[PDB]
Amino acid sequence: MVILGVGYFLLGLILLYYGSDWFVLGSERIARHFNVSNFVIGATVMAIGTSLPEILTSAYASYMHAPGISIGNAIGSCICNIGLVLGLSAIISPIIVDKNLQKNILVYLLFVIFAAVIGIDGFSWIDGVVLLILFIIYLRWTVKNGSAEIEKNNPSVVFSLVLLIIGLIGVLVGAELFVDGAKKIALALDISDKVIGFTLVAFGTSLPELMVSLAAAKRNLGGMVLGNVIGSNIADIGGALAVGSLFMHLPAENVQMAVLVIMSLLLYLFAKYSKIGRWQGILFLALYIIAIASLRM
Ligand SMILES: [Ca+2]
Ligand SMILES: [Ca+2]
Ligand SMILES: [Cl-]
Ligand code: NA
Numbered sequence: 001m002v003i004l005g006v007g008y009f010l011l012g013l014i015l016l017y018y019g020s021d022w023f024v025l026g027s028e029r030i031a032r033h034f035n036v037s038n039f040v041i042g043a044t045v046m047a048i049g050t051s052l053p054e055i056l057t058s059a060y061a062s063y064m065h066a067p068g069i070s071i072g073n074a075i076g077s078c079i080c081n082i083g084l085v086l087g088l089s090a091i092i093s094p095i096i097v098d099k100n101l102q103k104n105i106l107v108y109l110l111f112v113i114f115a116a117v118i119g120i121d122g123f124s125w126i127d128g129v130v131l132l133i134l135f136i137i138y139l140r141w142t143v144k145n146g147s148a149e150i151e152k153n154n155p156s157v158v159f160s161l162v163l164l165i166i167g168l169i170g171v172l173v174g175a176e177l178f179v180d181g182a183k184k185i186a187l188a189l190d191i192s193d194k195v196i197g198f199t200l201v202a203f204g205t206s207l208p209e210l211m212v213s214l215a216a217a218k219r220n221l222g223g224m225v226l227g228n229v230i231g232s233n234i235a236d237i238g239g240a241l242a243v244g245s246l247f248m249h250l251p252a253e254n255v256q257m258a259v260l261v262i263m264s265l266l267l268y269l270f271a272k273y274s275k276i277g278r279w280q281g282i283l284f285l286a287l288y289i290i291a292i293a294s295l296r297m
Contacts (some may be wrong), residue, residue, distance in 0.1 A: 051232050071250040085209050086225070
């Protein structure tokens with residue numbers, strides 16, 4: 001059963017690779033269909049789609065009386081999205097942020113700071129309710145500001161939705177096969193360790209974002225990348241973390257929240273006063289490496 005683990009592992013990689021490109025291509029077409037920016041489609045449809053693992057994971061974990069895993073994933077994902085995911089993407093395709101997209105990033109920063117402050121004493125179910133509402137407000141605010149009001153079953157639209165949906169299924173299934181495949185290899189080789197069993201799943205929920213953003217970066221879709229990262233973080237907090245708090249009070253993670261706030265602030269400052277390019281990406285990656293080397297497992 002080690003061969004089937006390798007089977008799942010490689011097949012997961014194949015589905016992630018091609019699925020992410022299809023998802024990106026389908027999303028880019030849908031953006032042009034609805035007359036919205038790539039940032040908007042990245043921050044809404046793409047972000048929610050790729051944060052489905054986090055939401056399910058956080059909800060399940062907190063339900064199973066493991067609220068540390070719930071908030072643990074979620075904040076961990078946010079750090080991964082800025083540090084690793086945006087870091088790699090910025091180097092591949094440097095981004096100069098337009099003024100009204102800078103506005104969206106600022107709102108994101110305020111959201112993260114607000115979440116951090118109310119999370120100092122942990123996250124109650126009331127905290128979750130508030131975050132979820134802000135999450136909803138953010139989505140509507142984002143769509144409208146990035147929408148161009150203008151107006152059968154056109155083959156261009158249908159094929160667009162097919163690419164998106166099948167692409168999304170490809171990255172989600174691919175991510176599961178990757179994790180399950182790796183988990184069965186490790187079990188077959190008796191090197192299985194649940195202390196690292198969670199870093200495999202935590203990173204696993206971040207695999208769709210990683211592959212999607214890289215694919216978009218390869219096609220110079222910087223707005224989509226930034227949208228995906230910003231939207232996924234908010235979805236991780238206002239969605240994944242929030243739902244977790246509904247089942248059980250989530251323990252405070254003040255160190256990790258502080259790290260996220262600092263990384264979010266840096267992201268805003270770079271977007272506002274400079275660019276998100278090679279050296280900003282290098283800094284993000286360096287910080288991420290420092291985080292995974294120092295933060296508690
Ligand atoms: Ca995810
Ligand atoms: Ca609280
Ligand atoms: Cl773009
Ligand atoms: Na996401």
